[PDB]
């Protein structure tokens, strides 16, 4: 299976540079062009540029010629893009993609890399249990007072997926993000335990919070 694995999220200073990876697997790196796409929050896709891995030859969107610099590394089968002189307008998700011929199209896409450009400092989430004081029960995790986006939440290390809602984060008047993740279970299936697994890569924060049911 073809696969495009991008570096993790990034907080960056105004004026700072940053270098994003796209490590490829499941195809001959040299036989396929790689393009880069930007997506601002609640926005459309802007094409940034391409790179022929065979020889390192590049095309750029005019609007990004001063901003972005693509490269490859044929040994690690890994393309990069460096963004220079960063501002708010550079706060975005950045996608690497593969071009195929049938007639050009972007036939595989990275999961995307969230870049936040800001002065303010990393802060890790506080993780609080949501437990109740019908035919279904609910519990969850409150993931409070973190910066920047994003966090990932799983339940029981990815073994509980069904009945799960991870709410999108709201920006609080404090300039810190907060969200809840919740699980519903039919009252019957008492059997199992419930632990939410929170990862904030920007702060190297990982937290497993077990939600005490207190059945007895």
């Amino acid at each position: 299976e073809v696969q495009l694995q991008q570096s993790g999220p990034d907080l960056v200073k105004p004026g700072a540079s940053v270098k994003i990876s796209c490590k490829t697997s499941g195809y001959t790196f040299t036989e396929y062009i790689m393009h880069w796409v930007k997506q601002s929050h609640g926005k459309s896709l802007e094409w940034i540029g391409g790179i022929i891995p065979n020889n390192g030859g590049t095309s750029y969107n005019q609007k990004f010629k001063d901003k972005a610099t693509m490269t490859v590394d044929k040994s690690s089968s890994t393309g990069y893009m460096e963004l220079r002189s960063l501002t708010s307008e550079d706060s975005a998700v950045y996608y690497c993609t593969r071009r195929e011929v049938y007639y050009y199209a972007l036939d595989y896409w990275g999961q995307g890399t969230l870049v936040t450009v800001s002065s303010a400092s990393t802060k890790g989430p506080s993780v609080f249990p949501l437990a109740p004081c019908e035919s279904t029960a609910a519990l969850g995790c409150l993931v409070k007072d973190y910066f920047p986006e994003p966090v990932t939440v799983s339940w029981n290390s990815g073994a509980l997926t069904s009945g799960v809602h991870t709410f999108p984060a709201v920006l609080q008047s404090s300039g810190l993000y907060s969200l809840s993740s919740v699980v519903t279970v039919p009252s019957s299936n008492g059997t199992q335990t419930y632990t939410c697994n929170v990862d904030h890569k920007p702060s190297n924060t990982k937290v497993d919070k077990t939600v005490e049911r207190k059945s007895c």
């Binding site: 459309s44 007639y103 199209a105 972007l106 506080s126 004081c133 279904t136 409150l142 984060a169 809840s180």
Partner: protein
């Protein structure tokens, strides 16, 4: 620099219905037009290339049409897993340009939320803030009134809401309302309650707890 316009950025359709998303270019682009689907989690899939050609592993419910400036993506019968934003892309000139996106809202039968209330943890209280959460699970449609009552006093200004994207199996929404108080405020009061009004409820549902 070629401009791609998706005039209708928000489209609603019932399961089973035929759905058409349109795209027009500022100048002719000779069928050099692709369609992508972005899921709520941000994953992007190519659906159609060169106007009409179905990418391998894409249901035949998807077709592409048109020529010159005007292109459409059609879904012959809408499925729940089709909830997405759809984008067109021209490759006639560089720079490659994209449409604004069309977010597909899915219409289904009314379902009332099941409602849950959660008090703050001691682990939060110990550091000076009380968050009280009210959950509305697996409802349609999206429109919902959540009112907070503290010892039966209607609240204003001290709560924030968030809503999931429409589910990919049951086309429902879930919503959280968080009531934020100082620890000191949380402790001057006994009953915390959220009252949910929704089309699927013949009268509002209240969930509450007593402190201490």
């Amino acid at each position: 620099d070629i401009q791609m316009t998706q005039t209708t950025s928000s489209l609603s359709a019932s399961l089973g219905d035929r759905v058409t998303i349109t795209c027009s270019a500022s100048q002719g682009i000779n069928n050099y037009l692709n369609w992508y689907q972005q899921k709520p989690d941000g994953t992007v899939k190519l659906l159609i290339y060169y106007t009409s050609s179905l990418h391998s592993g894409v249901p035949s419910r998807f077709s592409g049409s048109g020529s010159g400036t005007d292109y459409s993506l059609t879904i012959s019968n809408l499925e729940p897993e089709d909830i997405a934003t759809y984008y067109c892309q021209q490759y006639s000139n560089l720079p490659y340009t994209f449409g604004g996106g069309t977010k597909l809202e899915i219409k289904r039968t009314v379902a009332a939320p099941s409602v849950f209330i959660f008090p703050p943890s001691d682990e939060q209280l110990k550091s000076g803030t009380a968050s009280v959460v009210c959950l509305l699970n697996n409802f349609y449609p999206r429109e919902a009134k959540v009112q907070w009552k503290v010892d039966n006093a209607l609240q204003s200004g001290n709560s924030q809401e968030s809503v999931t994207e429409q589910d990919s199996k049951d086309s429902t929404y879930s919503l959280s309302s968080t009531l934020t108080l100082s620890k000191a405020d949380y402790e001057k009061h006994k009953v915390y309650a959220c009252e949910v009004t929704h089309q699927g409820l013949s009268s509002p549902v209240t969930k509450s707890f007593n402190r201490g």
